[PDB]
């Protein structure tokens, strides 16, 4: 039959999944589970709303629960808390929460024998993925990441937090030239500075004074004051217009030596008109994956580290040598 | 205690095996096995040379054999031949015939108990993996494959068999344009001729016919004849640099579109493929460790079996 998905939260990794799903046949969307009334929330794909306390009452209807909610607050509870009842997959994005977060949703995989496979998505994720074939392939090297065009929820608040700020949207942008040492083989080091740049566009409240503004935001400790910063004041259309979308996106580049001294260079690069909706069909293909680990009786709190590449396509191995080999 | 490996076939791959042991200070190199009269190959490393006869004797010192033979020469025999004994990696690049060759080494290791990853190299392996991962998180899309710029073993040592030349290098090269088509995003239709040009350097014999030669290597892609000094060859043709591209370019169900793209830039082709095969040796005495057996594929293989650190230390920092 075909893999029975769950997606417990819909915020914008929720709607990817659904969309996602219609790319993948072999894929039925069962529920969506929400903490806000269901009564109340309406879905795309127009299957069953339901109360996040409704699912345990769905363990025999669901194989995978894709866990769509936000990294800080909603997944350090909602991530160990399904994969006692199912087999799961996350986007869990807080690199420096990684060991905690993979060790609290493991104890209750295991206890559960369910397959959780943590921190899906690009980065961490395919970015990771990159990163560690580049260091195992090419062990004498460096490895530099850079991330977006993309923005930062982050910087926009704190720009919107400035007296005088109506609405801003702030991203992150990483410098060519950057991008383009690294490429030549010269192997600088490269802070987040060096490798990035900061655009912000913001909207004044009437009357603020553009100079004040412009100087809180470019004086802004920790958030800006040691990034090249370029501000534009814009209109509320303008954010509209063209500030609406969710492009993501960046480079990973390791730059390394044979033994006899030949400049080898790996690149992986994203460029996503939609950052959620590229997440949630990494999140789908994994699922893939974690539904074939069950049904081997695996276990378990993984990665990406942890699963092979065949798993996460719908072809047979023998179909995958044949063609893709 | 250090994996030991043992490299059979001394060749560009194998002094590419030799040079990536260097990096990978968890492996020792035991012995280079070769098919030639084992006093008469010099290999760098000096660690002994010994016949390929005597490989049986060393079941029991060496951990992974790295089979570094030509692919349609070479490996058709060792592949599963030195699967009755070891577990092995290879680098088998022909795609027609990977079928074949997975079945018959896969009958091999299976019987013998012992892992065997075959077809580990940029393309198959690296490149194979990106083709995979882009259809996957992208089923709606189109997926590219570039090679080059870079010389063409394979294309080059074709040339050298056509009467009155002496010596030849062919480059395959990717079209500057054709790739940005694809990075923009267009998803544009491509013929062979449209994403490739081939460009073969050759020295003719003394005495050979130039036009007789040029129609010889001409008679499917636009492909440009340099008749050049062996001076010019040696100054201007000696690297093996290669690399290229894979692109999946999609769309999201709602139409957003969607590019992965993954590259190599290669100073050294064989030192780049040897690397990756020392890489998956570890993997490949990985899974011996785990009770695996049977042929693998590039497709088998997480990725943390492929480093020397611990999962939890991968977690740590690179995840
Ligand atoms: N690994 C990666 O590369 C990667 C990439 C992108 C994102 N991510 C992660 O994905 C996480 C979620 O991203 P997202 O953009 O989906 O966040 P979001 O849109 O804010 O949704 C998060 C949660 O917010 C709740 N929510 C949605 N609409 C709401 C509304 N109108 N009022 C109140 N609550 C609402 C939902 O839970 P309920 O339905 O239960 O209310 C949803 O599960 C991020 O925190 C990020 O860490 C990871
Ligand atoms: N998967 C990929 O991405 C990828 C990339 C690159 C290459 N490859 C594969 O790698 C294969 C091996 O390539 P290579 O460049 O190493 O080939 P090579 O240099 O031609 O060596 C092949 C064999 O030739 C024998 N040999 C070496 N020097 C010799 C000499 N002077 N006289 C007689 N015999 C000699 C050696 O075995 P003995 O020591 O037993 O004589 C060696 O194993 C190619 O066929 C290609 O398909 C794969």
New interface residues.
Partial sequence: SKIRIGIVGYGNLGR?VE??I???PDMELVAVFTRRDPKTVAVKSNVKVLHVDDAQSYKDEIDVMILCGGSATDLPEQGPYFAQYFNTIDSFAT?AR??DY?DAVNAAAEQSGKVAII?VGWD?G?F??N???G??????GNTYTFWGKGVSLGHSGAIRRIQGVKNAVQYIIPIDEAVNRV?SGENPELSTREKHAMECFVVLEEGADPAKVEHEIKTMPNFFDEYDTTVHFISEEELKQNHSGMPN?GFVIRSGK???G?????????????NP??TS??LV?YA?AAYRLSQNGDKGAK????????L??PKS??D???E??
């Fill in positions: 990817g969309a996602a219609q790319q993948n690199h990684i060991p993979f921190s961490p395919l990771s993925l990163r560690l074939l260091e195992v392939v090419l062990p004498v490429r996106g044979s033994d006899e030949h400049k080898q260079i790996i690149e992986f690069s994203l460029n996503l008109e939609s909706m590229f069909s990494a293909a893939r990665t990406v580290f942890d699963i092979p590449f065949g996460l396509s191995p023998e995958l040598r044949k893709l080999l």
